Design a protein around this motif. Structure first.
Motif, PDB file in Angstrom:
ATOM      1  N   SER A  43       0.862  -1.208   0.000  1.00 33.31           N
ATOM      2  CA  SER A  43       0.000   0.000   0.000  1.00 33.31           C
ATOM      3  C   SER A  43       0.887   1.244   0.000  1.00 33.31           C
ATOM      4  O   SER A  43       2.004   1.162   0.606  1.00 33.31           O
ATOM      5  N   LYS A  44       0.437   2.366  -0.578  1.00 33.89           N
ATOM      6  CA  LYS A  44       1.395   3.426  -0.990  1.00 33.89           C
ATOM      7  C   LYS A  44       1.182   4.774  -0.303  1.00 33.89           C
ATOM      8  O   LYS A  44       1.959   5.677  -0.608  1.00 33.89           O
ATOM      9  N   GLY A  45       0.207   4.956   0.594  1.00 37.59           N
ATOM     10  CA  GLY A  45      -0.011   6.298   1.180  1.00 37.59           C
ATOM     11  C   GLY A  45       1.245   6.847   1.841  1.00 37.59           C
ATOM     12  O   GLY A  45       1.710   7.938   1.445  1.00 37.59           O
ATOM     13  N   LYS A  46       1.779   6.142   2.839  1.00 28.39           N
ATOM     14  CA  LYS A  46       2.907   6.645   3.665  1.00 28.39           C
ATOM     15  C   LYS A  46       4.179   6.631   2.820  1.00 28.39           C
ATOM     16  O   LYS A  46       4.973   7.589   2.924  1.00 28.39           O
ATOM     17  N   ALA A  72       3.724  -0.395   3.014  1.00 28.75           N
ATOM     18  CA  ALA A  72       4.306  -0.787   1.711  1.00 28.75           C
ATOM     19  C   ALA A  72       4.640  -2.275   1.755  1.00 28.75           C
ATOM     20  O   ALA A  72       4.907  -2.775   2.839  1.00 28.75           O
ATOM     21  N   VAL A  73       4.583  -2.965   0.616  1.00 29.04           N
ATOM     22  CA  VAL A  73       4.895  -4.418   0.530  1.00 29.04           C
ATOM     23  C   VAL A  73       6.010  -4.598  -0.485  1.00 29.04           C
ATOM     24  O   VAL A  73       5.857  -4.154  -1.641  1.00 29.04           O
ATOM     25  N   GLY A 123       6.542 -17.664 -15.283  1.00 23.67           N
ATOM     26  CA  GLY A 123       7.564 -17.562 -14.227  1.00 23.67           C
ATOM     27  C   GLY A 123       7.723 -16.174 -13.634  1.00 23.67           C
ATOM     28  O   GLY A 123       8.768 -15.936 -12.976  1.00 23.67           O
ATOM     29  N   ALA A 124       6.754 -15.274 -13.788  1.00 21.74           N
ATOM     30  CA  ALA A 124       6.872 -13.844 -13.401  1.00 21.74           C
ATOM     31  C   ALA A 124       6.834 -13.637 -11.870  1.00 21.74           C
ATOM     32  O   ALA A 124       6.957 -12.473 -11.399  1.00 21.74           O
ATOM     33  N   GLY A 125       6.718 -14.704 -11.073  1.00 23.68           N
ATOM     34  CA  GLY A 125       6.968 -14.589  -9.616  1.00 23.68           C
ATOM     35  C   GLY A 125       5.753 -14.705  -8.717  1.00 23.68           C
ATOM     36  O   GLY A 125       4.689 -15.175  -9.162  1.00 23.68           O
ATOM     37  N   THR A 126       5.907 -14.295  -7.461  1.00 25.86           N
ATOM     38  CA  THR A 126       4.963 -14.636  -6.358  1.00 25.86           C
ATOM     39  C   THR A 126       3.691 -13.783  -6.482  1.00 25.86           C
ATOM     40  O   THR A 126       2.607 -14.359  -6.466  1.00 25.86           O
ATOM     41  N   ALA A 127       3.798 -12.457  -6.639  1.00 26.46           N
ATOM     42  CA  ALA A 127       2.622 -11.584  -6.922  1.00 26.46           C
ATOM     43  C   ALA A 127       1.840 -12.180  -8.095  1.00 26.46           C
ATOM     44  O   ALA A 127       0.592 -12.256  -8.011  1.00 26.46           O
ATOM     45  N   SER A 128       2.514 -12.597  -9.169  1.00 30.21           N
ATOM     46  CA  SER A 128       1.857 -13.163 -10.369  1.00 30.21           C
ATOM     47  C   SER A 128       1.147 -14.475 -10.003  1.00 30.21           C
ATOM     48  O   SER A 128      -0.014 -14.700 -10.422  1.00 30.21           O
ATOM     49  N   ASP A 144      -1.219  -5.205  -5.234  1.00 29.12           N
ATOM     50  CA  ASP A 144      -1.129  -5.106  -3.751  1.00 29.12           C
ATOM     51  C   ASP A 144       0.353  -5.219  -3.322  1.00 29.12           C
ATOM     52  O   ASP A 144       0.597  -5.154  -2.132  1.00 29.12           O
ATOM     53  N   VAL A 145       1.276  -5.311  -4.273  1.00 26.49           N
ATOM     54  CA  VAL A 145       2.742  -5.393  -4.024  1.00 26.49           C
ATOM     55  C   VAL A 145       3.421  -4.158  -4.613  1.00 26.49           C
ATOM     56  O   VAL A 145       3.389  -3.961  -5.827  1.00 26.49           O
TER      57      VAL A 145
END
Ligand SMILES: Cc1ncc(COP(=O)(O)O)c(/C=N/C(CO)(CO)CO)c1O
Ligand SMILES: Cc1ncc(COP(=O)(O)O)c(/C=N/C(CO)(CO)CO)c1O
Lengths: 394, 394
Positions: A1-4, B205-206, B221-226, B233-234
């Motif tokens: 998440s991007k606010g801060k 932030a993530v 193979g584009a990774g974990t978020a994919s 959300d990343v």
């Protein structure tokens, strides 16, 4: 998440401003070999902003050595040195660097930066102390931060300050002094005789970072300890392969028992993939050439002495350099950005030094020599630098 | 000077002891390509200890791409990316990774390890917080240490612990959660759906480290978020080039404004030389192959599913892996060293995990698959592992 996170980066406006003013000259995309001339946006540009002091990234023997290592060993080792990432050629390069710098043993790292993180993070611990020259390279500050010791800065080459700060410390603690050999910003050399004399009185370990010294000072370019005759008063010699040695990676060399501790305890070697075969082979061949062919170091110094004389003769204000790094003072951040961009657009590549790295009144451009530079190229660049300094009113 | 430094390393006796017992199997010098068989001391050894998940370090197209980049660009860039170290091909690879992981922008680092140091050291500061999975990679712990923030560990994949620890923190502070995507030791996957749900509630932030995920999980193979559908959300996707991508280096990808802050503020990119041309070209060509040729990822998973089935069928005790990393429990440090050495001497390369990295009773060997492994090779290795487990009495 991007606010801060958005708020954290919100105040960083200098890049926006440089680009909108048409002054931005960072991450200039080069289209050619790193050489005395580079191609940018299809144009030719004189390169006086490199760390390839001996011009060896274009040496066909080093290119062929790297190409041959790719053929034999492939594109990567796919693991840390301590597990599946060691090659016979890594060990060969460690033996050859050990011999070059006059130490028992060495351990390679996949970058110079990681070469400093290794010994600084893992030798001094709780209740110990690291003493750093306040102008030490960022990688040394960061390495020291990764230790569990107390990190103390001393005044730049200030031996009274070093001695005082060491004298304050508990006797029952280990101490390590780490210094750049040649400091890249101003190009000056550590006072290694006085530093090692103090180290000996307090039984403090001494580590020297010779990133900018290897291939530049010392016998056959073997570095700062070699320059002063003080091999026996320096515990650890750290070097990089990204400057004179025309490659990527670095090493720490010293006593076999210390290097064995490091290679098994330093997180930047246990938890990072090894140097690629191509980089090992290019480092090996560059190291052979620097020793076998004294021409390279001689010509680097002919070029440095010529350029420095010419710049002082034209009335440039130079930093207290003892190296092929010629800092030229400008003493305004805005003029330093303007001068850099005007030179870029007229075909001269120099590196700016501005706030916040230095105070506005010490802002400068760094003009670095390579062995492969000609006097014709140095003359053309200084001619253009005189014209741009005039246009910029400095 | 060496008195206190000698005392600091004096207690480190395990390497001495391993060597004297004839058990030492670290820094095994390989004489050949990293492949499904490697040459050590002139002998052939089956390699089940690699991170080259797709077998691509031997791919002749990737070797030729690297060899062609050496011919065109030489052996090194001899500077940081922000100064004289950027090539057109660095920018091309950043655009191509941005596209692959579905982000605006990316910045390369000369190692994976330095790719984590960059964003972790410079985004959170004083009065901010970094939340780390307690099993996060060493480079993430070290990166976080280089920040001026408060670093807080949470229980491994323990979302209640993460949520509780985030709930304790001042509202008026920035927070960043950093997690391995696939955790290398046990091969398990982060609970990214619950982690991102908590991040969203606290506006944290993530950042995900996909060193072991790229070329392994996710679409092409584009990774974990994919893998989870959670690109949106990343904030930051970090990867390395030293595993599936058969090279050296890494990247961080994310929003153009964040990546622009990073490329200008991260000390591990400002103060470290850029990736060599050969590594850029081998990364570019590997990335093309992983996308264009779905065979590689399919075969990696055929081999993983086969080996895992065969090991469970033989009664090995396996870690809770979700990846090509098959941890085999031994639960004695002495048996783990013995098993590793006996396998090495019988032509099988595995990686030991021992104290102090893990408790004695969780000591194990890691058996990793590559796409280029055959069922014949997996069968030979498991046959030898059964014999050595019997001889070692585990
Ligand atoms: C999750 C994660 N994050 C970052 C890194 C560092 O990447 P690299 O410097 O390319 O080795 C690694 C390196 N991993 C090893 C093999 O597993 C050592 O831990 C070396 O490549 C990693 O596993
Ligand atoms: C004294 C010293 N010590 C260590 C390093 C790090 O070495 P490397 O990672 O090979 O760039 C550098 C890198 N130096 C630059 C160019 O000067 C950036 O500072 C990048 O190569 C250095 O100057």
């Amino acid at each position: 998440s991007k606010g801060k996170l958005g708020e954290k980066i919100s105040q960083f406006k200098i890049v926006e401003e440089l680009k909108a003013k048409g002054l931005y000259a960072y991450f200039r995309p080069i289209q050619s070999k790193q050489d005395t001339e580079v191609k940018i946006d299809g144009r030719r540009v004189l390169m006086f902003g490199s760390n390839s002091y001996l011009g060896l990234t274009t040496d066909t023997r080093i290119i062929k050595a790297a190409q041959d290592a790719l053929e034999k060993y492939g594109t990567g080792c796919a693991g840390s040195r301590f597990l599946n990432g060691t090659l016979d050629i890594h060990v060969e390069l460690e033996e050859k660097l050990s011999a070059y710098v006059g130490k028992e043993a060495a351990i390679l790292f996949s970058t110079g930066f990681q070469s400093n993180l290794g010994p600084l993070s893992c030798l001094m611990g709780r209740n110990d102390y690291i003493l750093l020259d306040e102008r030490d390279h960022a990688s040394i500050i960061d390495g020291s931060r990764l230790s569990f010791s107390k990190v103390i800065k001393y005044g730049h080459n200030n031996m009274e300050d070093l001695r005082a700060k060491l004298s304050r410390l508990p006797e029952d603690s280990a101490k390590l002094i780490c210094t750049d050999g040649i400091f890249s910003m101003e190009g000056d050399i550590v006072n290694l005789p006085e530093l090692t004399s103090i180290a000996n009185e307090f039984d403090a370990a001494v580590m020297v970072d010779d990133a900018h010294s290897l291939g530049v000072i010392g016998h056959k370019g073997a570095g700062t300890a070699s320059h002063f005759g003080l091999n026996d008063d320096v515990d650890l010699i750290m070097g990089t392969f990204s400057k004179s040695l025309a490659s990527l990676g670095g090493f720490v060399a010293g006593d076999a028992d210390v290097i064995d501790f490091l290679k098994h305890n330093a997180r930047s070697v246990m938890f990072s993939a090894s140097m690629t075969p191509a980089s090992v082979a290019s480092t090996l061949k560059a190291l052979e050439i620097i020793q076998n062919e004294p021409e390279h170091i001689e010509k680097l110094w002919k070029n440095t002495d010529y350029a420095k004389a010419q710049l002082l003769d034209h009335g440039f204000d130079l930093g207290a350099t003892e190296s092929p790094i010629l800092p030229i003072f400008i003493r305004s951040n805005e003029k330093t950005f303007w001068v850099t961009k005007m030179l870029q657009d007229d075909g001269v590549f120099v590196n700016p030094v501005v706030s916040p790295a230095v105070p506005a009144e010490e802002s400068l451009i760094r003009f670095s020599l390579m062995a492969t530079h000609t006097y014709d190229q140095i003359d053309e660049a200084i001619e253009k630098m005189v014209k741009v300094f005039k246009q910029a009113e400095v």
